């Protein structure tokens, strides 16, 4: 029940706000998280218009495959938070030692507004290979977007606004150009008394 293709598994993912009260005191609020503690399928035709669609778009990448590399995560985000650092962290494992590139596309009404690319290298770990993005800064667009949601009069408006906010993450083997993982993220405001939640789906044609 994981975000895992033939060659790569995303073990952890989180986006957070860390507040430094003093040099020895930090408070961290997780907005969304996977990995802190069969998958249903979603028809890709049902979400195509919420992601970039043209050459290199979600549909185009999905058609190139492999199809077992494509996932849709629905996050119920915990927006209940009160010297600030907005960051993202993620961890991946593979049986192979590869040079990988993670591309993150922030989208508004299915159009790309930001593209962030990071090259990641492997560390040997217990017979396998580990890849990690540790505390990468959230882009200014994202920070502004979080601020905007909080200053909306109602949470009914938050869900309608969040319906047109999506993220597409593409992880590629830099040397073979193979799609190792592709995760499409959709959002809603959480109403859980147990914090942020998620549903992970396999994307199918």
């Amino acid at each position: 029940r994981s975000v895992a293709s033939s060659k790569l598994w995303m073990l952890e993912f989180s986006a957070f706000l860390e507040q430094q009260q003093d040099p020895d005191t930090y408070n961290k609020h997780l907005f969304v998280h996977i990995g802190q503690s069969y998958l249903e399928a979603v028809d890709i035709r049902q979400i195509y218009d919420k992601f970039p669609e043209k050459k290199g778009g979600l549909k185009d990448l999905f058609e190139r495959g492999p199809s077992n590399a494509f996932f849709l995560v629905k996050f119920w985000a915990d927006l209940n938070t009160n010297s600030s650092f907005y960051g993202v962290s993620s961890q991946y494992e593979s049986p192979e030692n590869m040079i990988i590139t993670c591309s993150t596309k922030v989208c508004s009404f299915g159009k790309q507004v930001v593209e962030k690319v990071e090259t990641e290298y492997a560390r040997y770990e217990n017979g396998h290979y580990s890849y990690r993005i540790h505390r990468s800064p959230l882009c200014e667009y994202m920070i502004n977007f979080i601020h905007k949601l909080k200053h909306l009069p109602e949470k009914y408006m938050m869900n309608s606004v969040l319906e047109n906010f999506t993220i597409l993450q593409v992880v590629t083997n830099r040397d073979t150009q193979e799609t190792l993982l592709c995760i499409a993220y959709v959002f809603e405001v959480s109403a859980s008394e147990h914090g942020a939640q998620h549903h992970i789906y396999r994307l199918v044609k």
């Binding site: 249903e40 399928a41 979603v42 028809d43 049902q46 218009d49 629905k74 119920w76 319906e163 959709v186 809603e188 959480s190 109403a191 859980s192 939640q197 998620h198 549903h199 789906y201």
Partner: peptide, 16 residues
């Protein structure tokens, strides 16, 4: 099209 009227699993609207 609003997400609510799309061909999606029942779980899509059921926060864990």
């Amino acid at each position: 099209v609003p997400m609510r009227k799309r061909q999606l699993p029942a779980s899509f609207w059921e926060e864990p």
